[PDB]
């Protein structure tokens, strides 16, 4: 992904 480390509950 473009932001692979982001926790799943973060972002849209």
């Amino acid at each position, epitope marked *: 992904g*473009p932001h*692979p*480390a*982001a*926790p799943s509950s*973060w*972002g849209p």
Partner: antibody, heavy 118, light 108 residues
Framework: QVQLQQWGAGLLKPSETLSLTCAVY??????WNWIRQPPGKGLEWIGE???????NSNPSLKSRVTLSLDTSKNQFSLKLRSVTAADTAVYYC??????????????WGQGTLVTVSS | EIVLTQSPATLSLSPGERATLSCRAS??????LAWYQQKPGQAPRLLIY???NRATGIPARFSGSGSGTDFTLTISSLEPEDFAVYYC?????????FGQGTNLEIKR
């Protein structure tokens, strides 16, 4: 309601192998992290194992790191090989997770002070 | 690595004043920034995640904004409990990195 415990030997001589363990007591997407903080300095990330099994280490630790997770005991642990005085720091375990409603949490443990010296 | 640059190094203020803290990332991290507070002798404590969301129980005078590279933490009216060191952290990509920290001290 989550509680963190960490343990491991804190007094080491140079070139020994640090070994810390962290356990959680009390959620499905979780993010186990190790961070360390040398005295009087800022935070330096060590590594993460997440609930998908992604495993990553700080490149500055130069392949001296091993991360592991015993998912039966819920025990996250760290190995750091060939330690020098430069690895003296408080080592924190952090357990990031979100609950049944997409609220995010990241409690940190109390830390193990590790002193590497002859 | 993604480098986070916080500013200022030290913020010297008294209770009741507004505090603005900056964390700029070396490349776009979308909104995947978190802010932690650390007092002497304690582990860091999560305040804001995903740039703008307070963690449960964090008071409303703590506000986070930003998306892309420039992020801001605002404490609109300082309480004596708020004086401490503040770190940002990015969770866009490994390795996870922190800013160097901003010290928020009482001006006397």
């Amino acid at each position: 309601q989550v509680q963190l415990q960490q343990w491991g030997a804190g007094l080491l001589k140079p070139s020994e192998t640090l070994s810390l363990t962290c356990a959680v007591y009390g959620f499905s997407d979780y993010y186990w992290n190790w961070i360390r903080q040398p005295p009087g300095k800022g935070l330096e990330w060590i590594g993460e194992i997440n609930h998908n099994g992604n495993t990553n280490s700080n490149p500055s630790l130069k392949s001296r790191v091993t991360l592991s997770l015993d998912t039966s005991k819920n025990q996250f642990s760290l190995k750091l090989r060939s330690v020098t005085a430069a690895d003296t720091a408080v080592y924190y375990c952090a357990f990031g997770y979100s609950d049944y409603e997409y609220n995010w949490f990241d409690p940190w443990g109390q830390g193990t002070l590790v002193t590497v010296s002859s | 690595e993604i480098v986070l640059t916080q500013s200022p190094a030290t913020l010297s203020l008294s209770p009741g004043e507004r505090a603005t803290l900056s964390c700029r990332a070396s490349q776009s991290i979308s909104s995947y920034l978190a802010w932690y507070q650390q007092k002497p002798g304690q582990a860091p404590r999560l305040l804001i995640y995903d740039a703008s969301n307070r963690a449960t129980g964090i008071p409303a005078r703590f506000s986070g904004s930003g998306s892309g590279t420039d992020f801001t933490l605002t404490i609109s009216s300082l309480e004596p409990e708020d004086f401490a060191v503040y770190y940002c952290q990015q969770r866009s990509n490994w390795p996870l990195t922190f800013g160097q920290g901003t010290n928020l001290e009482i001006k006397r």
